[PDB]
Amino acid sequence: KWCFRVCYRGICYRRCR
């Protein structure tokens, strides 16, 4: 549940904003 854990702790979600 960090900045967006893009490609981690969930999945690939390029969008840290």
From Swiss-Prot:
Q: What does this protein do?
A: Significantly inhibits the growth of Gram-negative and Gram-positive bacteria.
User: Which organism encodes this protein?
Assistant: Tachypleus tridentatus (Japanese horseshoe crab)
Q: Note the SS bond partners.
A: C3-C16, C7-C12
User: Which protein family is named in the record?
Assistant: Belongs to the tachyplesin/polyphemusin family.
The tissues in which it is expressed are: Hemocytes.
Q: Where is the protein found, in the record's own terms?
A: Secreted
Q: Where are the Arginine amide residues found in this chain?
A: R17
Q: Which domain of life is it from?
A: Eukaryota
Which named protein is this?
Tachyplesin-1
